[PDB]
Amino acid sequence: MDERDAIVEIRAGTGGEEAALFARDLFNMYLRFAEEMGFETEVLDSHPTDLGGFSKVVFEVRGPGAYGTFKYESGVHRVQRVPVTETQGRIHTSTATVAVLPKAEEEDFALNMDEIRIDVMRASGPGGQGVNTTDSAVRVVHLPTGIMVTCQDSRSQIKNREKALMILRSRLLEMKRAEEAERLRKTRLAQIGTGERSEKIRTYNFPQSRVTDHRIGFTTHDLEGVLSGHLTPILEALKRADQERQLAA
Amino acid sequence: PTINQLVRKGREKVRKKSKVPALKGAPFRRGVCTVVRTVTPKKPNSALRKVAKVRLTSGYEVTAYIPGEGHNLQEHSVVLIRGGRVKDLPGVRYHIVRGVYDAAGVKDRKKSRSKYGTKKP
RNA sequence: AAUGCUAAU
RNA sequence: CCGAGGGUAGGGCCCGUGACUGGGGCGAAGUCGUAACAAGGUAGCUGUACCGGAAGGUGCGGCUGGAU
RNA sequence: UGAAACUCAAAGGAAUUGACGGGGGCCCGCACAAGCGGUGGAGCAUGUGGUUUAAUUCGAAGCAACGCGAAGAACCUUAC
RNA sequence: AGCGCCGGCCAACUCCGUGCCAGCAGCCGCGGUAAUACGGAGGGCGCGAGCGUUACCCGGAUUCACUGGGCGUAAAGGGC
């Protein structure tokens, strides 16, 4: 929860090259903010663009309470301004998506033999009296799930047992990873949605030099300061709202 | 065409197509809401439009628009639907009638109350 | 001989 | 004898549905190139044939809705 | 021989005024060519981007922003 | 004594609130911080024990053209 490390993913939304430039602006703002709060930042993944923006950038915030203080930045951020890619001088409305996740753990995978049943039996196919009489074929069964792996490759029961256990371990590890990835994907989608202009969480109006947080109706007029990393007023207002929302009864 | 060609073949009449087939010839239809959500319109409009998936007494299952500011509909709500498409929403051909069955009237509405189903204050 | 220019007058 | 109906067997047509698979319409942003509109940088279009990630290319013939 | 579902609020013909062309014609400019002297390398002065800072006030952004507003920043100026 | 409407079609305009949100919409379209187009108010217009909305039919549609249309380039002359 609020005390672990944070993974922050910034993606360009609608607006193309301007959206990538705005993603770069959000990246700079959050980097300066994390530095001002005392955390340590490392960039994990980066996909830059020719004009100096980012189509995607993933970085890490290390420090006690990183996730707890970056958990209000998730969602769609909207910018209204005249692009540098704009030729006729029009105002455009673009978006960038921010996803915040808690850094997970790397617990290793091991097979508990108390939930594993091993059967030995005769193999099939050629071999004469040997295959007629030897219990060389092995079956391993993971009792909680019913998944079984059978090995018959060698003439030796010991080698077949070892190979079957190895294959079963790989299969169970793959299933665990797949379910974890599905859960994380659903969390990401719940956070960022489609990136459309609606469902935005904050608006940065450059012509009006205004920043508006629509979750709490909080408007300020220091756009340059906010973009330089001065997010403390907005975050304290958001924490105020979160503490006040639990007024029960 | 010549007179003889008209005698041989005639002139073909024009057949109109119904725009509200799920109504099955009725002015209104009762239905039950299965999904209530918001959708985004097509260019150039931008909004979050409130719609409902409605399973009707006529056997069809359609999408209906919820007009007015604020609504109380949810899954298993009983509603009445009427004809009329919403232009900027793809595939939406019907309107929920406010003030009928489980669809309440619009609160604090002061103008055009016969639409939106609001009683006289 | 030489490719491209999103999206709100 | 006919005879409502029921039973058995084989057909015809239509409707719903199906693992998978093919394209189509759409999209205020993506990746690849740039085929067409200017002689669009190899004039374009066209029937057919073969070929290529893709737009397309080339062969044979045709048209000007091209030039000289 | 020859549909429909779905989808769009248009798709089109001719002509007009422009703009544009790696179309044509006729012209022009230190545009090229013909010359002479520079800049790009050094050190320093100065303005700017960035970065830093308690603050390093603000504006100017291709040509047509950058010895520009500033034809005089120790205090004052000065807006931080 | 109520109902609909007051951007154009179409009769009847100002203030406040909001800020591509909430919402309106039959078509064209409105709304992204000065909205006669959203919501409210004041005013106005049309009907009135009614006023609107949905569904269906004819009209407008000479848009299947008998009255009363077309086919070089707009859809349309069959390869002969």
Next chain:
RNA sequence: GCUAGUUGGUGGGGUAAUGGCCCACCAAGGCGACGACGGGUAGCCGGUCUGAGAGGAUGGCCGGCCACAGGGGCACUGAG
């Protein structure tokens, strides 16, 4: 493309009465692009709505005709 009681003839049965209506035998006919056969839909009219007319749509109530009486078949009585 359709038709085998099918199309016609002779004799008979049945009916108030004509008739392949039904039966026996003889011939091989009958229908169809002027749309047979098949599929879908539908009670029909005087009228009604719309429309400048021509036309289009429609057949609630009222008058006329037809069909049906839980779903099918059948006869009796009787002028019916």
Next chain:
RNA sequence: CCUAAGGUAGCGAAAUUCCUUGUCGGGUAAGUUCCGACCUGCACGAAAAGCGUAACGACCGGAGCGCUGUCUCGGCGAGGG
């Protein structure tokens, strides 16, 4: 980076698939076989031909109906030993 050149059409859990009873669909109350698909082809592939194909087969698979001492589950009878 390497090669003389890097497998084309078509077909594919196959008389070819080790993991394997792969996975999904069908058939059965229940299907390691069977049929239809997917492509991850251990280790298909174009005259040691590739992919199809009406008819034919004492060939080898899978399913249903009919009928039965095959069976539940055996009983009696005849003849030759």
